[PDB]
Structure 1
Amino acid sequence: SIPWNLERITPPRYRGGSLVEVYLLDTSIQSDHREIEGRVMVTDFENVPEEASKCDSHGTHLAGVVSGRDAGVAKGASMRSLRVLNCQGKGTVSGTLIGLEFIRKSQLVQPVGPLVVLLPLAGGYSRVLNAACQRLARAGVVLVTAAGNFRDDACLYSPASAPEVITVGATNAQDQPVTLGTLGTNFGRCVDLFAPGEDIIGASSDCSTCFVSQSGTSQAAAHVAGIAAMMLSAEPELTLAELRQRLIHFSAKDVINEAWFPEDQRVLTPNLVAALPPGWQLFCRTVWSAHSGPTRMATAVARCAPDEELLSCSSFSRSGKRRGERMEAQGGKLVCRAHNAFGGEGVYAIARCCLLPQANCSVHTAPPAGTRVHCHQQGHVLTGCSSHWEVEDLQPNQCVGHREASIHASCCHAPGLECKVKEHGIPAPQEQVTVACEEGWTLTGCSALPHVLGAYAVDNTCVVRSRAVTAVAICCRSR
């Protein structure tokens, strides 16, 4: 009989973490448990604050979820354990830092292959923990963390909030977000995806062949650590951006009922439940910025990874008080910058970031005049339209904006790419208008024809929010 969670991460067509090592920073573990014996090496690194069966419960279970013989995701995979949580499951930021540093030092002294670091813990937002995680990620290590169990915005917690760490929320057997007493899984834009995190069978430290069911974002993160281990075993050269794009791509989409989340967090929270994978293809993801805040000249910026191309840029405000967005070059690399309106509470910038190798992409801009600009060169394709304005009240390869606004086209030389535009207009002053690319096509750009609150890609659906109205999707695929 297959545990529900292992079935859930099996894709609709299916057929081992061996050159990969998974580090676990957790409680002590019962390393001679039959699930993990011989597979998990205890480093005996310990850095824990003052306060076996109970001390070892959390870590033993998670080691089993990642690598357990019977009930593990990446059966047999190699693990190394560091103890940074005491017998009550409590640790410190400083201890975690020292642990992360220990891992980097070990790698320098004895290099191996890809490393996955599982951090099934959370504290409050920490500048230093976030910085250490980002540095370890930039050094080439893959970090996976729990979103947190506080039924709250994961951006207020660390390392959940950290740039460059894969942050994982918990879903149950009905693909709904997990309740944990009066709390439950965290959510919001710092969560990358969800994974099974309720009623997860795994190694119990009660006895060497015992099993226990546990729930939490820890268990969910352990699933994604296991999936990542297997993905990196199959494709060892993946960059973090390539790995994250695959995690997103292979996830089950739109299975979570978003009503569970607070209203404002619904647009920010990815509707993704992790799964194992089942010719070159265009992968894109939607990157939401931090909110700009209410300052009159506030801007928000959404950025792509170094090996990604920004193919489009949109923006969103709950009130609708916005001055739009522009694509601009920052450190020789295009970013998505959104502008607040004077008297607005703030805006999000929303980047569409894609893996498009050998792409010569550029921005073509026209100032206020409707205002128009086009990708005029032969062999070039339009991937996105953006528009910003200064004022306080307002074909092939062409963008059109309001007469009082600047217009920006993302143009790419990519001969192996075919793009089409799909419009859908609703007369009714309806709160939402959507239009989706066809199966096998990737949405590169989402916008509204020129009072919209904003626009954003959700998977391969373009969504336009209104306080006719036409949603405009640019859809591309490999030829």
Structure 2
Amino acid sequence: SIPWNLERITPPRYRGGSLVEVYLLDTSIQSDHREIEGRVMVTDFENVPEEDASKCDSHGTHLAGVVSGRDAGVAKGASMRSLRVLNCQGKGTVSGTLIGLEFIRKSQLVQPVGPLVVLLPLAGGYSRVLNAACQRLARAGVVLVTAAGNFRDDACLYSPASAPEVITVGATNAQDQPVTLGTLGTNFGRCVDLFAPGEDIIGASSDCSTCFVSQSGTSQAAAHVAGIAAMMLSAEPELTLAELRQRLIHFSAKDVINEAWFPEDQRVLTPNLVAALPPSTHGWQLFCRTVWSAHSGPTRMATAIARCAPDEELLSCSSFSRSGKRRGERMEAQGGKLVCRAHNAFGGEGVYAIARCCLLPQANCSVHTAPPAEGTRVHCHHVLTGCSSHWEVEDLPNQCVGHREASIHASCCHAPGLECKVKEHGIPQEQVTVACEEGWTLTGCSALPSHVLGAYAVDNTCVVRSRAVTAVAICCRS
């Protein structure tokens, strides 16, 4: 009888949202529906384009029910407030969405409450102004959750999906596979933070005040994460956006999506995570996440930059190109904070910078660099959390070792209470793989210096891709 989606997000051990308020920007809603009556406040804010009744409020009503519905909702408690930015045809404007976001911020300033979650179950093409407004609202301390988009395309080409600091959610089905429907389906790629149930999702139907209907979409998926976030923020109201994102990743089901569904180049970029509620088991723990940059593009001196949130530390930095035409990567300071920078090679199509960003308070971290030797070595003379290497040439023990013609960089942290170890694995090979042990957190992933495309952490597994390769994982714990 439990809807498949609500079971799916239930953790393997278990035992809401009322201190939190969830704003919904959507079609009009049937607020007297019994799933949500008394739980959704209609603001009567409205900014919608002209057209060009049951149908008018179907989308919004269903999603209010996914978030907060008394029988089929994720956060059955939660208070919601709704703004109307989509017309009867499900169409809105960028300007209308901006005015809506601005209305939420003004409301907050006039009558402050607790943590706010804003669900944006909508998408248009990439928009500079919409992304900037989202970013600004996130920096003001509001959590934003948005749909990845339903076009079976790269979510970075859409807004607010592509918007920095917003939690972007793709849709998976009952078999934990990405939703597809011909040329249509869940978006994917590096702007998606995680997936959540978004096919065959039962919820309030505006056909009648007690009716239910199954609907599909990345908005339904996003509504699950909005619900989960509201619950997480009720339990731990002081969470920063970066702490909340790290928990959502950490409590997700991992490696359950078959990545064959995605286009080949998007597989490495797309997180293999399906959202879940935190377990009754939660005592400090080391949380890390992998942050892929935008592709640098093909310019000879091109660089890609991957950054961490202000309250995170960059513990390592890697890079990847599909061709292998690569000059590696280095950690460089920038506004007094370390970023991961990767360098394209001459004639390369471009590269990605790949940061490992971790929540490590009281850490004092530095970088130790050695320029090319005649091989090259550097050590934390402190625990080593990461090795990087870059070169300027066209071709060839708390210690990092690089090529004799390359610079080598060690990330060294003073982190009392932190234990780290290094695990190596090598074989004759398109891909070699080495995983940290359960309860340990991968902080760094690199290849021992036959032609490597790059290296990247996937959860707590270090992956090395080549065209006698040895993967090296640095693993730490409290």
Same fold (TM over 0.5): yes
Q: Would the aligned equivalents of 1:125 and 1:158 in 2 still touch at CA under 8 Å?
A: yes
Q: 1:214-250: CA deviations, max 9, x gaps? A: 0000100000000000000000000000000000000
Moved over 3 A (4+): none
Shift of 1:54: 0.6
- How far apart are the structure 1 equivalents of 2:16 and 2:308? 30
Shift of 1:180: 3.3
Equivalent positions of 1:383-402 (< 5 A) are 383-394=385-396, 396-402=397-403
Name the SS of the counterpart of 1:228 in structure 2: helix
Q: 1:161-191: CA deviations, max 9, x gaps? A: 0000000000000000012353100000000
2:344 is aligned, of 322, 325, 340, to 340
- How far apart are the structure 2 equivalents of 1:266 and 1:72? 31
- How far apart are the structure 1 equivalents of 2:63 and 2:421? 46
Shift of 1:259: 0.3
Shift of 1:16: 1.1
Q: Would the aligned equivalents of 1:9 and 1:274 in 2 still touch at CA under 8 Å?
A: yes
Name the SS of the counterpart of 1:65 in structure 2: helix
- How far apart are the structure 1 equivalents of 2:354 and 2:78? 37
Partner of residue 287, structure 1: 291
- How far apart are the structure 1 equivalents of 2:234 and 2:321? 42
Shift of 1:141: 0.2
- How far apart are the structure 1 equivalents of 2:456 and 2:155? 21
Q: Would the aligned equivalents of 1:149 and 1:180 in 2 still touch at CA under 8 Å?
A: no
Q: 1:95-129: CA deviations, max 9, x gaps? A: 00000000000000000000000000000000000
Name the SS of the counterpart of 2:433 in structure 1: strand
Q: Would the aligned equivalents of 1:56 and 1:87 in 2 still touch at CA under 8 Å?
A: yes
In terms of mean alpha carbon deviation, does 219-228 or 173-182 score higher?
173-182
Q: Would the aligned equivalents of 1:289 and 1:301 in 2 still touch at CA under 8 Å?
A: yes
Q: Would the aligned equivalents of 1:180 and 1:216 in 2 still touch at CA under 8 Å?
A: no
- How far apart are the structure 2 equivalents of 1:182 and 1:408? 44
Q: 1:32-91: CA deviations, max 9, x gaps? A: 000000000000000000112110000000000000000000002000000000000000
- How far apart are the structure 1 equivalents of 2:247 and 2:368? 30
Shift of 1:452: 0.1
- How far apart are the structure 1 equivalents of 2:181 and 2:69? 25
Partner of residue 461, structure 1: 461
Q: 1:449-470: CA deviations, max 9, x gaps? A: 0110000000000000001100
- How far apart are the structure 2 equivalents of 1:139 and 1:37? 30
Q: 1:407-457: CA deviations, max 9, x gaps? A: 00000001110000000010xx50000000000000000000011000000
Shift of 1:477: 0.4
- How far apart are the structure 2 equivalents of 1:351 and 1:216? 30
- How far apart are the structure 2 equivalents of 1:440 and 1:38? 43
Partner of residue 308, structure 1: 312
Give the TM-score of the pair, scaled to structure 1. 0.98
Q: 1:231-281: CA deviations, max 9, x gaps? A: 000000000000000000000000000000000000000000000000100
Name the SS of the counterpart of 2:117 in structure 1: strand
Q: Would the aligned equivalents of 1:26 and 1:119 in 2 still touch at CA under 8 Å?
A: yes
Q: 1:10-50: CA deviations, max 9, x gaps? A: 00001111000000000000000000000000000000001
**Unmatched segments (≥5 aa) in structure 1:** none
Name the SS of the counterpart of 2:224 in structure 1: helix
Identity %: 100
Name the SS of the counterpart of 2:33 in structure 1: coil
- How far apart are the structure 2 equivalents of 1:363 and 1:190? 28
Q: Would the aligned equivalents of 1:36 and 1:76 in 2 still touch at CA under 8 Å?
A: no
Give the TM-score of the pair, scaled to structure 2. 0.98
Partner of residue 382, structure 1: 384
Partner of residue 27, structure 1: 27
Name the SS of the counterpart of 2:248 in structure 1: helix
Partner of residue 118, structure 1: 119
Equivalent positions of 1:307-326 (< 5 A) are 307-326=311-330
Partner of residue 5, structure 2: 5
- How far apart are the structure 1 equivalents of 2:207 and 2:99? 29
In terms of mean alpha carbon deviation, does 177-186 or 143-152 score higher?
177-186
1:372 is aligned, of 362, 368, 377, to 377
- How far apart are the structure 2 equivalents of 1:37 and 1:180? 33
**Unmatched segments (≥5 aa) in structure 2:** none
Q: Would the aligned equivalents of 1:60 and 1:203 in 2 still touch at CA under 8 Å?
A: yes
Name the SS of the counterpart of 1:364 in structure 2: strand
- How far apart are the structure 2 equivalents of 1:402 and 1:177? 41
- How far apart are the structure 2 equivalents of 1:182 and 1:467? 31
- How far apart are the structure 2 equivalents of 1:22 and 1:317? 40
- How far apart are the structure 1 equivalents of 2:183 and 2:408? 48
Partner of residue 329, structure 1: 333
- How far apart are the structure 2 equivalents of 1:425 and 1:207? 62
Partner of residue 226, structure 2: 225
- How far apart are the structure 2 equivalents of 1:45 and 1:55? 16
- How far apart are the structure 1 equivalents of 2:17 and 2:141? 17
- How far apart are the structure 1 equivalents of 2:183 and 2:199? 15
Query: How many residues in Structure 1 have an aligned counterpart in Structure 2?
Result: 472
Partner of residue 141, structure 2: 140
Q: Would the aligned equivalents of 1:170 and 1:178 in 2 still touch at CA under 8 Å?
A: yes
Q: 1:271-304: CA deviations, max 9, x gaps? A: 0000000010000000000000000000000000
